[PDB]
Amino acid sequence: DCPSDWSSYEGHCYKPFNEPKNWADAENFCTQQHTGSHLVSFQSTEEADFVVKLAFQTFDYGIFWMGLSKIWNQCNWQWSNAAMLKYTDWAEESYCVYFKSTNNKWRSITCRMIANFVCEFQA
Amino acid sequence: DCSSGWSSYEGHCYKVFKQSKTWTDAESFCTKQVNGGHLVSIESSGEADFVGQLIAQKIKSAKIHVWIGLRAQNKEKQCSIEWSDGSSISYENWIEEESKKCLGVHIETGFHKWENFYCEQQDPFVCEA
Ligand SMILES: [Ca+2]
Ligand SMILES: [Ca+2]
Numbered sequence A: 001d002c003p004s005d006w007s008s009y010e011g012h013c014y015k016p017f018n019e020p021k022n023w024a025d026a027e028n029f030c031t032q033q034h035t036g037s038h039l040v041s042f043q044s045t046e047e048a049d050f051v052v053k054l055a056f057q058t059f060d061y062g063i064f065w066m067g068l069s070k071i072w073n074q075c076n077w078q079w080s081n082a083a084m085l086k087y088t089d090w091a092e093e094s095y096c097v098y099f100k101s102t103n104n105k106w107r108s109i110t111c112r113m114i115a116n117f118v119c120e121f122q123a
Numbered sequence B: 001d002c003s004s005g006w007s008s009y010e011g012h013c014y015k016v017f018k019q020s021k022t023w024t025d026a027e028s029f030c031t032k033q034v035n036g037g038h039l040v041s042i043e044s045s046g047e048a049d050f051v052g053q054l055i056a057q058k059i060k061s062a063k064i065h066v067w068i069g070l071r072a073q074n075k076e077k078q079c080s081i082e083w084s085d086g087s088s089i090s091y092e093n094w095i096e097e098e099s100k101k102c103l104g105v106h107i108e109t110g111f112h113k114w115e116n117f118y119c120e121q122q123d124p125f126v127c128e129a
Helices: A023-031 A045-059 B023-033 B045-058
Strands: A007-009 A012-021 A063-065 A077-079 A095-100 A103-110 A115-122 B007-009 B012-021 B066-072 B102-105 B114-117 B123-128
Touching: A007 A045, A012 A023, A012 A045, A023 A063, A023 A115, A045 A103, A045 A115, B007 B045, B012 B023, B012 B045, B023 B066, B023 B123, B045 B123
Parallel strands: A063 A115, B066 B123
Antiparallel strands: A007 A012, A012 A115, A063 A095, A077 B066, A095 A103, B007 B012, B012 B123, B066 B102, B102 B114
16 A cells, blocks of 8 residues: 555555656655655665556656665776775766656766656555 | 886886776786776875876776776675665666776766776776786
8 A cells, every 4th residue: 555646566665756857855744745665676676667657648758866875886896907996086976766757767977967857665 | 126128116016908808807907907906096195196197007097997996895785784764775777887896086076086987898907916
């Protein structure tokens, strides 16, 4: 059971929003929509297709935030000449994952980007 | 002192290569051009300025970027340990080209800012020794 304004799927509740926000703001926003609510997470292909259809039929075409952030921030970045990494000049500090309402493929873009999103919680 | 065709800056030798190669092939190629060769490493403002201008001398297109020697060692698609909801990453559905673990500089910033690019992309590069 999900509130009237959310859609249910496999014991979970999902809801798309079209108020453009960066990743951090979207996540924070989702937590305030219902207890246990966060940006959507994908544990399978069926769940992914469900959410994509939901987003499209509600707002069409657009990019929607997914619950993955700072995806390469903790990676082991090294210079191939073994030089110590001190001086840096990153164009983007962090990357986040999103999907287009037209397909279930994961895409990456800077977390500063403005996009739609989908919230989810366990019922 | 640097070999013919190579430019020197602070005791090092550099050379821009117009041929397009993947990050890995570029790196491998550099090791064979000169002893101690590798894809360029940018370790200071001064070096970044010099390398940026060196590149600008040969590359005048915006349809490609230039490979530098910084790369994320991890084999995984991403290095995050969990979703914002706490669950583990037990499933993925990445578009290969969307995992950008190799860095390069683009003409849009005068070849200065490091941008994330798909490692298997073929692009010009710079070797340093
Ligand atoms: Ca989920
Ligand atoms: Ca260097």
